[PDB]
Design goal:
Assembly: trimeric
Strand content of chain A: 35-45%
Number of domains of chain C: 2
Organism (chain C): Severe acute respiratory syndrome coronavirus 2
Chains: A mainly beta (218), B mainly beta (211), C mainly beta (170)
Number of strands of chain A: 19
CATH topology of the largest domain in chain A: Immunoglobulin-like
PDB class: viral protein/immune system
Structural class of chain C: mainly beta
CATH class of the largest domain in chain A: Mainly Beta
Largest sheet of chain C: 5 strands, antiparallel
Largest sheet of chain A: 6 strands, mixed
Protein name (chain C): Spike protein S1
Number of helices of chain A: 0
Order of helices and strands of chain A: EEEEEEEEEEEEEEEEEEE
Structural class of chain A: mainly beta
Helix content of chain A: under 10%
Helix content of chain C: under 10%
Radius of gyration of chain A: 22 Å
Distance between the termini of chain C: 21 Å
Oligomer: heterotrimer
Keywords: Spike protein S1, receptor binding protein SARS COV-2, viral protein, VIRAL PROTEIN-Immune System complex
Largest interface: A-B, 40 and 48 residues
Number of domains of chain A: 2
Radius of gyration of chain C: 17 Å
Amino acid sequence: VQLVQSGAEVKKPGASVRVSCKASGYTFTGYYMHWVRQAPGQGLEWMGWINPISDGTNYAQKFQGWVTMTRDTSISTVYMELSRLRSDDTAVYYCARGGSRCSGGNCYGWAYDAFDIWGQGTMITVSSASTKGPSVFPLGGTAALGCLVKDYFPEPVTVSWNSGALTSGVHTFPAVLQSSGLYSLSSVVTVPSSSLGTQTYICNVNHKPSNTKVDKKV
Amino acid sequence: SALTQPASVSGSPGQSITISCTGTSSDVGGYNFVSWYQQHPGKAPKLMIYDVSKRPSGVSNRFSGSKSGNTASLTISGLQAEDEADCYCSSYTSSSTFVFGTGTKVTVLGQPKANPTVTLFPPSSEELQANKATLVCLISDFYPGAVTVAWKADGSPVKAGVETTKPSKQSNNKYAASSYLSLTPEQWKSHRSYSCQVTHEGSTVEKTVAP
Amino acid sequence: CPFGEVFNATRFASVYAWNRKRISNCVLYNSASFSTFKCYGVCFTNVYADSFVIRGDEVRQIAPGQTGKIADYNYKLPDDFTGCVIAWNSNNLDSKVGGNYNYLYRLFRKSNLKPFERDISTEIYQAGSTPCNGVEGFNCYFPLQSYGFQPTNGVGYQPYRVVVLSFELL
């Protein structure tokens, strides 16, 4: 019994977005399909739900009209549209499963029991910028090398050091939105001092929405 | 459309904590359908308690709760720093809709005060040929997660181009954050040494790098 | 008569909108092929044929004076049931992976049926003085649920097709 949402998407203000929630391994029509919003820092605001059996919506009194929920039977997938996107719609929107088995005795039970994978929505005017990857060299017991990845938009970027099971002390800090609509993270490593000059350290940065793979030597 | 939790609850290791969920005579009164959800930072919600008292499999028996009158309770027994989260309550309504409570942060007291370990990197000379420059300050393994971050330029402070995260939990219960310094190659080379200086509970770790 | 049109028919409807492939103007037990073969009571004038989805427990439902969900709120019979009924499996046909929502059955309805009505509504079953207007939620539901049939279901929970052969003699 498992759910998966679609991936993070960016929209300019005024536009809309398609956001899907996909069921695997349980009866998609017996239980209701709800959806909840968690903006950064705020609590969970219930939005609405959708009966997977052919139609049927109820919304909460702040999302009505401009949020529109629909489903499709073939691939066990449900969809949420956000029309008239403005800046503080930027949030994390969950789909929620918990619902209409019964009101009887044999079968019953409520309360959203299978949530999903936190599908981001980022609303800004700034265009897609790609990663610019300069190294950061080390300074002796320990040592700390890393890759700076600068001036990109949007999230995320996948970093992996030497692209595989080389992950002794790998710490990849979260980016800060710099004051221009761009991002910048950093992936620092902790390596023994004697390994330097003997081992080769090469991060793998991959930014999907600009089609950018980058590798450098440190 | 309003079910009332306290914003903040504070409990000791080993002890039990009470988290009430107020709801007057609409859904918490006559409708035994109060439900509780837990949320760790980064993670999605998780079903703590459904159906007033019952628990779903996998959830520790340490959790428990009842509902009488206009107050619904969720009680954590034998607390753990593992339990530290946001615990929302939830009910469904005569209004046919669905309504979450305001949300309750649990803090679990008694954790070692940890100092930040700071690494500072110099500007990237590849970027100097690209005609930009960045200082990188990495702040790891501190608690409680509060850092004031100030940048200096061989003694006097620099205000413009300093861009810093808000502290964020890593995966080992201590906190972490980054700071960066937008800088122009002419200003970097002209100076002697810039400084990253982090303040946490009144601390003085100040990594410094020079051209 | 058109049996291969009716019987071995690749799609059968959810019971809530039960089919009537009436025939006119025109052995099944022997060489055994089916689960429930009951010729209750026993030339016809007007013969009536029907087919819908049910699981393997509730073939009990479709009978004179018999009580429960696919009798009550889906398809009910009179007390003088003269005819033959052919029920048999369709798990290798009616059971896809991770859900079979192609099927349905009426759950929520105020009353049962009389004999042989069809009723297909998706109108929100009125539950409280709090209105529905089509806006469901609490006090307002969606009348049906799907069978959600699937293959490992044991002796109880697998779809079994049905042939109803009722007769009326004017």
